[PDB]
Amino acid sequence: MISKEYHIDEEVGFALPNPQENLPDFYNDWMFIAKHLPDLIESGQLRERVEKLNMLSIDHLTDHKSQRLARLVLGCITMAYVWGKGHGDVRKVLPRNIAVPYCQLSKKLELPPILVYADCVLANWKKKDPNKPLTYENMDVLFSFRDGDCSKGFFLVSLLVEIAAASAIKVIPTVFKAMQMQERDTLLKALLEIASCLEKALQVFHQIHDHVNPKAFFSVLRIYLSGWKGNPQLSDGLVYEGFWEDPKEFAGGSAGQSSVFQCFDVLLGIQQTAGGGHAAQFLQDMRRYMPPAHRNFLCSLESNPSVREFVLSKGDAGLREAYDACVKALVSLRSYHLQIVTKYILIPASQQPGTDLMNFLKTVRSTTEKSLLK
């Protein structure tokens, strides 16, 4: 058993199970905007609309799911407001009527006031048919930015990979129990199962091509996911009017915000967040952009003993082969993510009349390769 305090689902892992679609009536003015962003942005009514909103309390967002749906709604509106039509005409100040509730809600959920992976992937989905299984074809996102933005493809394939890797997450207790009870055969079986789920996760990742378009992604969706930390477009950051007197920098959406993106590297003793390098700094900093229960989960993995030391100590080819099966699977995932960045960011950028992400991932991959045993 993984503790329920870590918010991990048997079926969907780190994803929020059955995310709420609708808010209470008190927040109808937020939902009218968030549900109609494609029209409200393409006609320039979005910015004016947000300015005409009253400042609403967060006291009526009672349960976790409602609070998370609101974080998604406000996060998407914040991005839509800041970036507008997404042609470099930017807002350096977020209006108090939306800033105050978003910042208060954010502090309550222990997340930064900006759209993160946990919002727009982990909570931004529904099933069409509850009886049918979790396939792309039985699924939809709750919110989008623009028509043709491929948010469905981008978020749902991302989500499907998260789900696929969650099959391994439930093996992790088996892994730690087998070490302390010195159960070689159990540990071997666990590591081969983990390798198998990450192999499946990669096959799932292939769907990205079927549902996402390079032009659309680069020109449109990338812009809406962009944040304001070390971004020339908002040099000093964003002003959360009525909450902070001074502007504040926050990072945009990133796969590094996925707890699955990190947790196996941790489990397998791949010291990604050790180094003192930019990649190690980035990964650690993104733990603050994950929900608190999830970042706690990563922390408890780190506190448990080292799987890598355990395998190394034993002089056991079979265990080393199973540990390496897992390492190989992660390498492949990194390699694949790089091909996606190449097709969807590098090449489109070149046609415009990526590099930092490439170098970031090359380092992560290289650190992974160097963790192989044989």
Ligand X SMILES: O=C(Nc1ccc(F)cc1)C1(c2ccc(-c3ccc(C4CC4)nc3)cc2)COC1
For tokens 């408890």, name the residue: 300
Residue type for position 282: F
φ and ψ of 112, to 5 deg: -80, 150
Q: How far is the CB of 62 from ligand X (least distance, A)?
A: 27
- Is 60 annotated to bind ligand? no
Q: Is the Cβ–Cβ distance between 62 and 109 less than 8 Å?
A: no
Q: Is the Cβ–Cβ distance between 17 and 9 less than 8 Å?
A: yes
Conformation bin of residue 242: beta by default, left when phi > 0, alpha when psi is -120 to 50:
left
Q: Is the Cβ–Cβ distance between 71 and 111 less than 8 Å?
A: yes
The helix (H) or strand (E) run that includes residue 140 is strand 139-140
Residue from the set 8, 161, 178, 283 that interacts with ligand X by CB under 6 A: 161
Q: How far is the CB of 43 from ligand X (least distance, A)?
A: 25
Indicate the length of the chain as a whole number. 374
φ and ψ of 61, to 5 deg: -100, 85
Q: Which stretch binds ligand X (CB under 6 A): 65-73, 166-174, 258-266, 272-280?
A: 258-266
d(CA 61, CA 26): 10
Question: Does residue 253 bind ligand X (CB under 6 A)?
Answer: yes
Q: Which stretch binds ligand X (CB under 6 A): 12-20, 117-125, 169-177, 289-297?
A: 117-125
Question: Does residue 121 bind ligand X (CB under 6 A)?
Answer: yes
Q: Which is nearer to ligand X, 30 or 217 (CB)?
A: 217
Q: Which is nearer to ligand X, 58 or 333 (CB)?
A: 333
Question: Does residue 268 bind ligand X (CB under 6 A)?
Answer: no
Residue from the set 81, 117, 145, 240 that interacts with ligand X by CB under 6 A: 117
d(CA 228, CA 172): 36
Residue from the set 70, 105, 260, 283 that interacts with ligand X by CB under 6 A: 260
Residue from the set 79, 100, 120, 197 that interacts with ligand X by CB under 6 A: 120
Question: Does residue 258 bind ligand X (CB under 6 A)?
Answer: yes
Q: Which is nearer to ligand X, 57 or 339 (CB)?
A: 339
φ and ψ of 115, to 5 deg: -65, 125
Burial of 143 from C-beta contacts in 10 A (0-12 / 13-18 / 19+): buried
DSSP code string of 252-285: ---GGG-HHHHHHHHHTT--SS-SSSHHHHHHHH
The helix (H) or strand (E) run that includes residue 296 is helix 292-303
Q: Which is nearer to ligand X, 120 or 187 (CB)?
A: 120
Q: Which residues contact 35 (CB under 8 A, 6 or more apart)?
A: 143
Q: Which residue is nearest to ligand X (CB)?
A: 253
Q: Which is nearer to ligand X, 50 or 333 (CB)?
A: 333
Adjacent-strand bridge partners of 139: 127
Q: How far is the CB of 124 from ligand X (least distance, A)?
A: 9
Question: Does residue 266 bind ligand X (CB under 6 A)?
Answer: no
Residue from the set 142, 223, 255, 267 that interacts with ligand X by CB under 6 A: 255
For tokens 């039985």, name the residue: 138
Q: How far is the CB of 131 from ligand X (least distance, A)?
A: 27
- Look up residue 134 and give its two tokens: 């979790």
Q: Which stretch binds ligand X (CB under 6 A): 136-144, 189-197, 256-264, 277-285?
A: 256-264
Q: Give how many residues touch ligand X by CB under 6 A.
A: 21
Q: Which is nearer to ligand X, 154 or 250 (CB)?
A: 154
Question: Does residue 187 bind ligand X (CB under 6 A)?
Answer: no
Q: Which is nearer to ligand X, 61 or 260 (CB)?
A: 260
Contact set for ligand X, span 301-340 (CB under 6 A): 330, 333, 337, 340
Question: Does residue 264 bind ligand X (CB under 6 A)?
Answer: yes
Question: Does residue 158 bind ligand X (CB under 6 A)?
Answer: yes
d(CA 272, CA 12): 25
Binding residues, as ranges, are: 337
* Site of interaction with ligand X (CB under 6 A): 117, 120-121, 154, 157-158, 161, 165, 208, 225, 253-255, 258, 260-261, 264, 330, 333, 337, 340
Binding residues for heme b, as ranges, are: 337
